[PDB]
Design a protein around this ligand. Structure first.
Ligand SMILES: CC(=O)N[C@H]1CN[C@H](CO)[C@@H](O)[C@@H]1O[C@@H]1O[C@H](CO)[C@H](O)[C@H](O)[C@H]1O
Length: 634
């Protein structure tokens, strides 16, 4: 017989190791590894040792490694042994490591993690977690120091019109952290409460408490959560109920998507929103969007903006001057609050009387303002937000192809439309993928999470390491799948109850039941009424992005869709996904039911819920309807 038996190496250091023992991969890669003699083994007795100040990091790492390795790993202070992982903050190593870099020394004193900041240590611990969670507990000795090439590395997450659940957001933040991604542009509505803004408290919105909680999580992971309220275009979710602030065309037709930048009250309204957001985000940036103001039309149709431009910025001024003037006035406004403005590149155009302020970060997504190379010449600060790194649920033109970009030598200097700039441009901040809902019934948020995996690893690698150590994309892919998700994602209880037959009293106004629950590949349920044989759907009501956003919309019974199929089945998407339900457990015990696409919660309507939508239509009192969680958490 073969005699095959586990090696079972003693814990700690060994001067003996095979010369080509695998070094488990990480993402980002840690390039320029120097090999040492021997190897180190996590095993019984291994501890995470640190100073008091690093105690929380050490405790979280010990707990996490205990779970991945099945070895009891505890945190400690004091002296470290060769059996141990040590965490060290050495702020004198800024030159070598910068603000986010780290050094690993693996050898006879154990596995040392050194960073120059708390986040550097944390980012080193992500590599330790990666290297140890792939079924190999012995690591080759040696040393490496790594630090990111670019300062801003991450994603646009448009949690916009539709709601991206806070649970999704928490998972996303965990994934970003694992990948050393430090930037998320979160276009989103914070629920407006003031007398002057509260009519825009339509769903999607996030509560102050909710935002505070995910910003605190983000910040502990080294992530800058930058809010965006897009202006002066794409303003439908803000202006629908404020027609007094909407821009009219020459014929008097208003667009709920356009702010009237000639109306000072409209401008004040936008600034009021800024001030509401200032209380809950911690970032030093404000992103005002500024994309697609005139989509589907032109400035020729808005003579009033030319008139305004001339009054405001002098004879000869054009609507493009008025537009840029509005951006510079918002720049002034946020600077006075201690923030730096960011915009999308596309409305930056041909001005006469006004020039765009150079202290505004330009996030470049569209070959449309200047070429990037033109903007470089003028000294603008640039982030690469190419459409090559977009996903959309509906627009199939936008699906990131990581294999292609990896193989074709894309780098962070490769601006939209294959427009290359010096990737060492000293005002090139980094790069990001972008995750856009657009027509939103085609894919659940859970399907988006499955789809974005590869691309998130791609961008992580190219913004930190700017290298291609895997010979092809396919070699990368094999290692990223081995590395897998971070612990929080593996722990998330997608489907907390077993498929089976249930009594659900909340649903009595639809049917006496019982209900047959089955699970879906994307972590939802379909609920079949055993009386009618039909399935529960959230199908009807006023929509944004083709998803029901109406507060107080009622579910209904419909012929049962096939919820077992994938997102490639685009023809049946809406009936399918309107039949998916997310079930969550309380802290502690009780279950809530949420339409998967909408992320509101089913509740029995009391008639005392307060929301602008309900001022004009309420579900009949005592019937089951969807509501944002804040209206039914009493
Ligand atoms: C900056 C940008 O990409 N602007 C738009 C054009 N491309 C993407 C992908 O199709 C669009 O999603 C972008 O518009 C954004 O749409 C969302 C809803 O999906 C919001 O309305 C944003 O305000 C808008 O910028």
């Amino acid at each position: 017989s073969s005699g095959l038996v586990p090696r079972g190496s003693h814990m700690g250091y060994s001067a003996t190791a095979p010369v080509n023992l695998t070094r488990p991969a990480t993402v980002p890669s840690m390039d320029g590894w120097t090999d040492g003699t021997g190897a180190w083994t996590l095993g019984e007795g291994t501890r995470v040792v640190s100073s008091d100040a690093l105690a929380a990091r050490a405790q979280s790492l010990a707990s996490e490694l205990t779970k991945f390795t099945d070895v009891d790993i505890k945190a400690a202070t004091g002296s470290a042994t060769g059996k141990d992982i040590s965490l060290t903050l050495d702020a004198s190593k800024k030159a070598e490591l910068g603000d986010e870099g780290f050094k690993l020394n693996i050898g006879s004193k154990g596995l040392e993690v050194i960073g120059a900041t708390d986040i550097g240590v944390f980012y080193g611990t992500r590599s330790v977690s990666q290297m140890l969670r792939q079924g190999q507990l012995t690591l080759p000795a040696g040393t490496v120091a790594t630090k990111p090439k670019y300062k801003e590395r991450g994603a646009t997450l448009c949690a916009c019109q539709i709601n991206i659940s806070t649970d999704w957001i928490d998972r996303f933040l965990s994934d970003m952290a694992d990948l050393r991604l430090n930037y998320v542009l979160l276009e989103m509505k914070l629920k407006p409460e003031e007398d002057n803004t509260k009519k825009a408290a339509t769903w999607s919105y996030y509560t102050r408490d909710d935002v505070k909680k995910f910003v605190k999580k983000a910040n502990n992971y080294g992530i800058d959560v930058i809010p965006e309220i897009n202006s002066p275009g794409h303003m439908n979710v803000w202006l629908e109920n404020y027609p007094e602030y909407q821009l009219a065309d020459n014929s008097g037709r208003k667009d709920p998507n356009k702010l009237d930048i000639s109306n000072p009250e409209a401008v004040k309204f936008y600034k009021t929103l800024i001030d509401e957001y200032d209380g809950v985000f911690t970032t030093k940036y404000w992103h005002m969007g500024a994309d697609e103001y005139m989509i589907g039309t032109s400035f020729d149709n808005y003579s009033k903006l030319k008139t305004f431009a001339e009054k405001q910025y002098g004879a000869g001024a054009t609507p493009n001057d008025a537009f840029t003037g509005f951006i510079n006035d918002i720049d002034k406004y946020v600077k006075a609050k201690g923030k730096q403005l960011r915009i999308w590149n596309d409305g930056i155009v041909n001005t006469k009387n006004v020039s765009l302020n150079k202290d505004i970060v330009i996030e470049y997504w569209y070959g449309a303002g200047r070429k990037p190379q033109e903007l470089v010449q003028d000294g603008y600060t640039l982030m690469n937000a190419t459409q090559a790194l977009y996903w959309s649920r509906s627009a199939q033109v936008y699906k990131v192809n990581a294999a292609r970009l990896y193989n074709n030598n894309w780098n962070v200097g490769t601006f939209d439309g294959g427009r290359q700039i010096d990737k060492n441009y000293d005002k090139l901040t980094g790069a990001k993928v972008s995750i856009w809902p657009d027509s939103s019934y085609f894919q659940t948020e859970n399907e988006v999470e499955k789809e974005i995996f590869d691309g998130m690893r791609f961008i992580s690698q190219m913004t930190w390491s700017d290298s291609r150590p895997w010979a092809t994309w396919n070699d990368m892919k094999a290692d990223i799948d081995k590395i897998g998700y971070p612990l929080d994602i593996r722990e998330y209880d997608y489907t907390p109850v077993d498929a089976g037959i249930y009594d659900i009293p909340q649903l009595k106004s639809i049917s006496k039941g019982p209900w047959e629950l089955i699970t879906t590949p994307d972590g939802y349920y379909q609920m079949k009424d055993t009386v009618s044989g039909k399935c529960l759907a959230l199908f009807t009501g006023s929509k944004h992005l083709d998803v029901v956003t109406q507060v107080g919309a009622r579910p209904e019974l419909r012929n049962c869709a096939d919820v077992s199929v994938g997102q490639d089945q685009r023809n049946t998407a809406n009936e399918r996904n309107t039949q998916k339900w997310q079930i969550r457990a309380d802290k502690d015990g009780k279950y809530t039911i949420s339409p998967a696409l909408t992320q509101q919660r089913l509740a029995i309507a009391t008639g005392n819920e307060q929301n602008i939508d309900l001022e004009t239509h309420r579900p009949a009192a005592g019937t089951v309807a969807q509501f944002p969680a804040d209206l039914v958490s009493d």
